[PDB]
Write a structure and sequence with these properties.
Order of helices and strands of chain A: HH
CATH architecture of the largest domain in chain C: Orthogonal Bundle
Helix content of chain A: over 70%
CATH superfamily of the largest domain in chain C: EF-hand
Family (chains E, F): Belongs to the calmodulin family.
Oligomer: part of a larger assembly
Largest sheet of chain C: 2 strands, antiparallel
Pfam families (chains E, F): EF-hand_7
Strand content of chain C: 5-15%
Main location (chains E, F): cytoplasm
Number of strands of chain A: 0
CATH topology of the largest domain in chain C: Recoverin, domain 1
Keywords (chains E, F): Acetylation, Calcium, Cell projection, Cilium, Cytoplasm, Cytoskeleton, Flagellum, Isopeptide bond, Metal-binding, Methylation, Phosphoprotein, Repeat, Ubl conjugation
Distance between the termini of chain C: 14 Å
Subcellular location (chains E, F): Cytoplasm, Cytoskeleton, Spindle; Cytoplasm, Cytoskeleton, Spindle pole; Cytoplasm, Cytoskeleton, Microtubule organizing center, Centrosome; Cell projection, Cilium, Flagellum
Amino acid sequence: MNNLEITYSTETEKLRSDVERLRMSEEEAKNA
Amino acid sequence: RTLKAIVYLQCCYRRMMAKRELKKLMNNLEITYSTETEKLRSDVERLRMSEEEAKNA
Amino acid sequence: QIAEFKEAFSLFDKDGDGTITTKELGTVMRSLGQNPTEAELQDMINEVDADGNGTIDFPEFLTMMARKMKDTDSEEEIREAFRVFDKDGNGYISAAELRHVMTNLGEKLTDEEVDEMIREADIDGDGQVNYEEFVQMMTAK
Amino acid sequence: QIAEFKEAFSLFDKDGDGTITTKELGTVMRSLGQNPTEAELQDMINEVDADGNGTIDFPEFLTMMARKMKDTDSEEEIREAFRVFDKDGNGYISAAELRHVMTNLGEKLTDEEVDEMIREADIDGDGQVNYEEFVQMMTAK
Amino acid sequence: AEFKEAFSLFDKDGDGTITTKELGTVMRSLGQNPTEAELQDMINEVDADGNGTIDFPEFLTMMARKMKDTDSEEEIREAFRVFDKDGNGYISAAELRHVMTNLGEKLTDEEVDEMIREADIDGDGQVNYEEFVQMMTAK
Amino acid sequence: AEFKEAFSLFDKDGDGTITTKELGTVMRSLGQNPTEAELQDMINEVDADGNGTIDFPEFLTMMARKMKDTDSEEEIREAFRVFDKDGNGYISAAELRHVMTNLGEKLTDEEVDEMIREADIDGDGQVNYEEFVQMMTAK
């Protein structure tokens, strides 16, 4: 239970905001 | 606005029905983290290399 | 809690085996209180022990309730219903119109399910139903 | 199967609540039969139905066993043990040497765990133990 | 895109037929966007002259006859104007009401008022039409 | 690389001390690869002359004094010869036994025989030494 669910939940956000970091970095790099 | 409100009510109806009936008579989550933790290790080295490329650019 | 829900389970048990047929899993959940579908029930059957079981004990069920509590409690949120038929906004619908929406639309109820339901439901001499009162009665619990 | 394990669970329950403290999850698994670590028990306490739970029911536990099964079963493969201390190949080790290896090395047992163990273990008048017999007794099940 | 289930939700009586004036709504419950004109032309090109109601077979035969026009109404995913040429990305609420209630198959002012509820309007008096078209459709 | 736990597996008596002749094995249980020579030099440069046993503090002071040599023995991850110059990638089992049992800190023929168990040998009589070095170390 209920003590792991909380942290995998936070981790799923981490590779969501970071893909929007890498995509914008790719876009910036491609404009460069 | 209609049919989905109809179906949700029918669910509740069915469940009030049997509400009368009963007054007469661990392994498999581990496997997700262990893959995922590798992924944001792998793409941390991707945006760092992209940062390095962008800095050289 | 568990005392009303045990006396409940005891009365579902017919045979007195301590176990109830897996088919009557939905019918017990309803009768603690909860409002789930028929689909939710089949989705919570896909656990290797219950999927293989012919009958379920009161422990087994108590666990099924624990592991799906969040989904199960979601179903007792609703108090409001739809209506269609009243376009003029009288506040009332005929018994014919009520039967039509229940038996011909959505998850289609039987006539016998509707006839069981109209035994509790205030119907005037005209043959009409205040649908605001009727929604309050069906959600009253 | 489930009858011996249920009587088992019933006797772990002290209070008679139907549920046993989550700390005593390891102690029950052992006592169906299985040989797992303490670590396997805490890597198994990482679901979203036992690590918020202060207690566990017999169905929760049965559900737990079903999903781990393979891993849990793996632990009842071993019949052979290590020894160190006999270099001359007598087939025997002292009780002192046995206590040292259990309490000082590896996962470190307590003296009280060793003293509980020596109650079932043939020890001669000399104070020595046939370690081939002793491995057979500890794996006998 | 024929659907018997959708027809059974229009048929509320279990007669098997639905009114000929619910033909436009049945198409736009199926998927299909046909114009009010296109709806009249499809009825008029059948001798459904005296027909008060339509059965599912009749409705099936009309959609098969008119499949090409009717399919075209569900191709479009984007929607340019031709009411900005400057390319500001903005249109006045006055011009937006005028196109809706004065051009084409005119909306009522009450329908337009509903669509400008919760739609931001600046101090010039202009609305982002790209957001407004997305907010209308993507719902 | 000091480790009190590793010392506590060598101390089997709980005296606190281990024999001075188990000094090489304790280093090579910790991580460290020191030569048998290097092991003698480190003991000889302390007046552990009459010392029959070593405590964990004494062993700690030796590793700190000799850290630089001892660390060097765990840098190496690869291992060229100098017994192939042709660059065939192969060495005879005869030359491989000779280097092991006749050069340097000589291995016994029984140790070498153990290392050539399950090691493929062609019809020339030669072994892939790159695979043989990997198969010895990567275990």
